[PDB]
């Protein structure tokens, strides 16, 4: 396949796009919806089919003023773990900022009792909050399998470290519970990670050529949004921060001449040829945003192929232009 | 062209779909967005292109509690009148129901000072409310030109007539002011117009074969939602209700075996061949709505060709199935 085989932007008005190619021959898609009020799934046999795929709501936010999970439903990811579907997402009990001017999200998990994850809301049950030793702002969780274990990777505020959030990892006791104390892998520190907000968020994991590559997003969700990357040997101690190497420069960023601003909160999938790696990310096409960029709904989902360098590292290149007619 | 050339649903999660093919060949699209908080426009060179067309916000709702136009921005239509762009839309000052359990919408108009209607929000000016002699619930306004005059057609509640709204016509003094007293063209009365809720709304006008054909939607918005049609000779007194003929049966209804439930609030356009008439409407693929139905976002935009009967009347057929892969 080639980039031009896909009509971009693939999915309008969907941020934090997550695509999972399942064994049933379907691509499953989850993302943040503009009103941040529910979790819906789309499915199609092809990536282009997702642009017209009728969604199904499988979980709705709790009522206003009812406590946990009642506001700002962010970045759900659908995972298939030991034959069961799980969705990891973040939510807050309020839209109010705390005394540090931050969002009040925590991490949640829902589990499906059916082989079809899109049949009905009644098939999904809440496990509640995925707790961490320190109860602070946490979001954008993802999971990956390595060394016959399940790892959980997420973004969280540490009061002792400057900025909004750092990336952590921990091994899981089960799909909704941590077994180990969190380990910090990266914090915002370079100029490209600290524009408007000091942020490391949106982790995603790729496994290839004897290594795990963990991409993440940094800076605010406007034009400054960019992707960084950590690398680790697949057999190392994943819970030792010295096992991981951090890229000093972004691995993916704005392509300003073609009006692709702030690419980020990515995921990875495979094309319909079963071989080409695909980068899935959101991106904006203008910068004259009014108000908070999180409430402008025009982060659009993009998909494009990526390749591999001779040293076995990924080469993401740059955002491709829109090509709809 | 043929129905299979279009990937349906054309535009997911857009209700009250309005497509206008401009003299430069662009297809412009306006609709109610699921959060009902703004007016955005998409443009593409093809109807399928609209599925991936990056929207632009051209007008946003007024702040909460500030009065007119502050809530529930519904059903915008983009019209090109005497070389200027106008958008007719409905809005409320509140989300609360009136003492009769009804929505509190009134009709509004904005005008653009630029040839490009998607350049900037600063290009649009508010004309305010389009006032009617009785100040009651009103929405879904459309306009058409006939006999060198401009006619305004809309839906409005009459306290003396059972149901949520009837269809009215009036001649306009200018694009934001009525010249004549409203004339009622149809009220909900047939069995197929009064299922669960008594309503006539979403008017649309088609001109062909010496007649104007005014379609509208009736009944509740589940599988009972259906389209009616009025017919009048193109040279008749359009303000005399006795010039108009009401179809005693619906002209378009649910296609129950393929789960196309409740087609309505239509508009009309022309295909890329410049010849084939296209019906544009919203429709659901399920009716088992959970939570507040106002915020279930899955009314999807459908497009399909229609044809003409021997007597010069349109034949809409029935909803086509989804055909995305
Ligand atoms: Mg994620
Ligand atoms: Mg309309």
TrEMBL record, chains A, B:
Domain of life: Bacteria
MF terms (GO), sorted A to Z: hydrolase activity, hydrolyzing O-glycosyl compounds; metal ion binding
GO biological process, one term: carbohydrate metabolic process
Annotated binding of Mg(2+), by residue: 77, 265
Gene3D superfamilies the record matches: Glycosyl hydrolase domain, family 43 (2.115.10.20)
Protein keywords: Glycosidase, Hydrolase, Metal-binding, Signal
UniProt record similarity statement: Belongs to the glycosyl hydrolase 43 family.
Official protein name in the record: Beta-xylosidase
